[PDB]
Amino acid sequence: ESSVTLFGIVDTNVAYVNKDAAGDSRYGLGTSGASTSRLGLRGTEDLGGGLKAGFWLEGEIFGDDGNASGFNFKRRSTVSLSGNFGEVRLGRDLVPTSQKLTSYDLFSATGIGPFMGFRNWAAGQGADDNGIRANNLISYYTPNFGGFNAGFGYAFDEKQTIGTADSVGRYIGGYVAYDNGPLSASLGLAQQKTAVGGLATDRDEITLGASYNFGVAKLSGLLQQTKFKRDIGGDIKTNSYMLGASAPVGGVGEVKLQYALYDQKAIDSKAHQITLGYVHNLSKRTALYGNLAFLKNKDASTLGLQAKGVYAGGVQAGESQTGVQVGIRHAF
Amino acid sequence: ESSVTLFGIVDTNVAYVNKDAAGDSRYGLGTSGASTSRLGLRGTEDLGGGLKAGFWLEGEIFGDDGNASGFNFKRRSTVSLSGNFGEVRLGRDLVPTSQKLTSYDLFSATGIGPFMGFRNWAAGQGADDNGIRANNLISYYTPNFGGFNAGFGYAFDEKQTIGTADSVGRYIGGYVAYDNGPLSASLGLAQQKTAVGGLATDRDEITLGASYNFGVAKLSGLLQQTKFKRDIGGDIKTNSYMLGASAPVGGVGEVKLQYALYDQKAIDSKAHQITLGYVHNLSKRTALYGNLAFLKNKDASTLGLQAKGVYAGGVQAGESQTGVQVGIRHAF
């Protein structure tokens, strides 16, 4: 029951957005429209008695530029022990809140279509103020007993200091969930320490997600409140909402539709997004895909679609933006 | 018919040049004298009906310093589909013009001996103003039908802006060729967008190559004109010529001789180069090799031999430079 695996995904696309921050269209070769491109090594070693040791080293691939800024293992770099008690992991990884709750996003938290809640709404100065991953992380995942399951993590700040914050990067968080196969629901809660403009700030996040797979189609949704609360007073609060559906089409095909709303209280502005996706499987490993998204900013909102490798910046206040990605995803 | 391959080459050498830009000799441990040192992963997946999906991730290795500046996949990072129609590749790679035409260089476009035509003659400000590789590349390669074959590529600029150039990095190019085994000939044409001193400039390149393998020996040659044409007027034009021969010696050995001329019109100066090479195969994977080169600059020319990892800068105007590399190439 021991093995070692070298694996990855190259997902590269052509992409277009009709406007950038100057109002000009952009198009080009981008990446990671259907799944994040990656390269990794992992293993499991059977130690006897149901105890296993694991490792996992994974970094993002950027096929449009050959990883010009250098390859790393920032997606995951863990060592773990697992057994009938669950699993304990040490190292950089998705924090438990994002690992579990991003599963409700039908666009796999990548490309132009996905839920944007896990983002740095306040221009926090920490390394991971999108709430997705943490350095210096220890996590514990329970088994699933009768559907119920939970995860918990703590990431050490190691006295990282920015301005009046001397614990930048601390994470404490976890979730409780129910997963029985067709039905899934989770509640996550997390706090990170950060700074905004050099002033100590808490990043507080509460997230609820649920889905039901009817077989002929799946319904999924997310609700999140993210609040950056500055110690001396003041807060940047965002409420993010998403509902989506996916369905198999003709064997080999899949259609996806997601709607999202981002209510950015600090600028009293909303943005709305609608994304349509299609995936056509040539094999279990190889798919062609297309995404089409429409993002409507109101008032002072300046959110932009995330066409990785082409354009992922903002747009002018109150502008609507259209984006398209067409590509190929190849897993190995 | 599916597979995955982890592969590479470590080619490390001792090297010497008798002068640098100050007129002093340099010697040391360098790399990539016979083949470029590399590490890569590639795969082919049989999809049925003659259709295949591929990936290829490859970066250069620098064995003298342990890749001190960080490992990347800048040599190639593609995903592809191939079939009876030919092959389409997405991602950073050699552009079709260089991929095909560099095959005529008997020194494998590496070390002190190779053809220097694919270089940044004008101090263009783009990432790839040597015309070798491009970011954001899509390429199409035909099958070989009755000898005839062709390749075409387009690389997106993605509005990269330097001074008055707002399409830096664009490539459009291709070749037509005839290859029947012993005889090979190709004509390549390409244009890149760039800037020189912040002023928009086209990099235009036309290249002809041919070779014939007699078995007892092979004759090969290249002719190229590279013109950097500035939009407001003015141009830096270089005509590059090479003729070479190689022959097996005693089973296990190979001797190579190449002569080149670089006519640098913007400085009204020529440089001439003669390189002798020997390769001694210990196995199909492992070879010992030696290169000896003599580069004569005339007038204002300051070209230097490319002893990678020891010295690859220029020399004083009108100086002649001698270089030597002795090393080992090990493929895996």
Binding site: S3, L6, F332 | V4
Partner: peptide
Amino acid sequence: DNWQNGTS
């Protein structure tokens, strides 16, 4: 152990 691909 021999190194396997992602799909085993």
